[PDB]
Amino acid sequence: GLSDWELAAARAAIARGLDEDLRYGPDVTTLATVPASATTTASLVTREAGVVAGLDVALLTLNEVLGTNGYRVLDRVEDGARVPPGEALMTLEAQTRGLLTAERTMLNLVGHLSGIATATAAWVDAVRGTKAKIRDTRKTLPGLRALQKYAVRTGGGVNHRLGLGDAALIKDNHVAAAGSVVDALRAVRNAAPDLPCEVEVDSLEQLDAVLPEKPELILLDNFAVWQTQTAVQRRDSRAPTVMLESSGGLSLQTAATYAETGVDYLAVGALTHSVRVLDIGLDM
Amino acid sequence: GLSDWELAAARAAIARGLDEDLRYGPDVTTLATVPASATTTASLVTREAGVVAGLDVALLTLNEVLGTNGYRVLDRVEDGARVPPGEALMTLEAQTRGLLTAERTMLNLVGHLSGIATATAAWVDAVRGTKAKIRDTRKTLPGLRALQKYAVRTGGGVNHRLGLGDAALIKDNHVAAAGSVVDALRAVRNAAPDLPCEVEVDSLEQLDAVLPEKPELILLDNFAVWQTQTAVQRRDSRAPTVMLESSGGLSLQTAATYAETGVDYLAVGALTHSVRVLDIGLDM
Ligand SMILES: O=P(O)(O)CP(=O)(O)O[C@H]1O[C@H](COP(=O)(O)O)[C@@H](O)[C@H]1O
Ligand SMILES: O=P(O)(O)CP(=O)(O)O[C@H]1O[C@H](COP(=O)(O)O)[C@@H](O)[C@H]1O
Ligand SMILES: O=C(O)c1ccccc1C(=O)O
Ligand SMILES: O=C(O)c1ccccc1C(=O)O
Ligand SMILES: [Mn+2]
Ligand SMILES: [Mn+2]
Ligand SMILES: [Mn+2]
Ligand SMILES: [Mn+2]
């Protein structure tokens, strides 16, 4: 499921999580109430409906606390599964002390990632019957980019760039510094001709100015729906190969409206910066 | 503003943030569009109203990217300031290249921490005229506990425990393993007699059972307002010294209603697990 750098990202996050929990001493309450030889069957069950993501991270949290041979998975659901309230995402058998200590860290990761995949899916359903794909941004939390990114993919969106040197994206602050969108575009092309180039426009005027330069993608920043319609109309007639991406004034209520204008992508920051946790509990 | 461990935490977070942005190559678009000698005056300004928190983290991000003597702060607001849309939280003068590279990492942190402080303050205002204090939980994001915990305090909340060995808290799964709340309570009392003890009850029945044991705090889990009122009446008559904390079915709409019952605290998970970013931009 997770790739190598995602897996490594997950391990680093679960380690930071456990360290936050354990740095003040051991789990005194678990140690005191449950014997070392105790063993139970527990299930991660959703208190609500949504799309599940990050189940492997649950397994990595246990590997860290109990060791690979410290637990047994009697059953599990697959990442990306649409799930109702009360559904058992995974049933385990493991040393009780290990589960009570690992509980919060593992639940915190799975609820966050599931919350993103559940949101992402909402957006994906909203623009169904359209050609628009939902994309994320770099408005991710430090240390969780690979995981948050993985989660939007699980819900059906498509990742944008993972970093700064990943692809070029000429922003308002660059244009300001370069003095002109076409100047900046030209500069980026000359410096990194092999790198994907996206140019951000703030108006129909700038839009007209960059279409002839034929950048890979144009990001329509904070365009009203009527302006997005015009943009697509101009792109379609003047530079059929330029992809258009809406970003800025996007809400789930307007997603379809923008998608219907014919844009190729909707870039949603909310997907990673304003996530509502999917409520999950560990039941014994 | 930030303490030593919070500072070390911020530093670790900013470093993980920058590494995510730079691991694919340098900021190609900035290097190409802005000269090394470029310098600007920039401001972090809110696109929305809210409470500000995490400004020092912005500075720490610049120290890391431009070095201490790489910039100058012409003006700044204090953490915890209630702020309107379009307010300039901090005005800097710095090398342009350094700002554009630091921008996203610093913005993502300040936005996150401010979103938390903004939400916390809404809860705090909600229970105003009551004696209840708003507290957080361990439902924090991995690697960000110290910072998230710092933010609820900036918003007016009061921190709960920071980890597992920090204070004792008997939960449902412990009760399940110990076979009883009173059993579990007795066990913890024997193991860590010097440690603060909080026990979680799911019913007025368990409440009656633990009140005589006189634990430090009792967490009323998912009680209706009427049950919360009853519990306050029983506590007041049977164990005046026992503090009560509501946690579970809390919404900002009901906050005051529960606070009015006379409980000492409201423990809010949403404060740290479902945060809506405060929208902030770097304007040059
Ligand atoms: O408002 P700006 O001057 O364009 C600065 P900003 O840091 O917002 O720039 C980015 O944010 C938007 C990302 O999706 P969302 O809006 O949902 O968060 C998009 O406008 C981006 O180029
Ligand atoms: O539903 P449970 O069986 O009590 C498991 P859970 O992990 O929810 O247990 C904790 O969550 C609540 C925290 O505040 P919030 O609800 O806002 O997130 C509270 O019930 C806690 O003891
Ligand atoms: O994070 C951003 O500012 C952003 C917002 C929208 C599209 C893409 C990006 C990006 O840089 O990849
Ligand atoms: O994270 C939790 O389950 C939690 C929830 C509410 C209060 C306190 C805690 C805690 O363990 O400190
Ligand atoms: Mn933008
Ligand atoms: Mn914006
Ligand atoms: Mn609970
Ligand atoms: Mn719950």
Question: Which tags fit this structure?
Answer:
homodimer; 284 residues; alpha/beta; Aldehyde Oxidoreductase, domain 3; TIM Barrel; 2 domains; six-stranded parallel sheet; four-stranded antiparallel sheet; 45% helix; elongated; binds ligand PPC; binds phthalic acid; binds manganese (II) ion; transferase (chains A, B); Aldolase_TIM (chains A, B); NadC (chains A, B); EC 2.4.2.19 (chains A, B)
Give a structural overview:
Two copies of one chain form a homodimer. Chain A is of the alpha/beta class and 284 residues long. Chain A has two domains: 10-118 and 275-284, Aldehyde Oxidoreductase, domain 3 (Alpha-Beta Complex); 119-274, Alpha-Beta Barrel (TIM Barrel). In chain A, 45% of the residues lie in helices and 19% in strands. The first copy, chain A, is built from eleven helices and twelve strands. In chain A, the strands form three sheets. A six-stranded parallel β-sheet of chain A has the order 6-11-10-9-8-7. In chain A, helix 1 (4-22) packs across helix 4 (96-126). Chain A starts with a helix and ends with a strand. The interface between A and B is large, with 73 and 72 residues. The complex binds ligand PPC (2 copies), phthalic acid (2 copies) and manganese (II) ion (4 copies). Residues 137, 139, 171-172, 200, 221, 247-248, 250, 267-270 of chain A line the site of one copy of the ligand O=P(O)(O)CP(=O)(O)O[C@H]1O[C@H](COP(=O)(O)O)[C@@H](O)[C@H]1O. Chains A, B: Substrate binds at residues 104, 137-139, 161, 171, 200, 221, 247-249, 268-270. Chains A, B: Pathway: Cofactor biosynthesis; NAD(+) biosynthesis; nicotinate D-ribonucleotide from quinolinate: step 1/1. Chains A, B: Involved in the catabolism of quinolinic acid (QA).
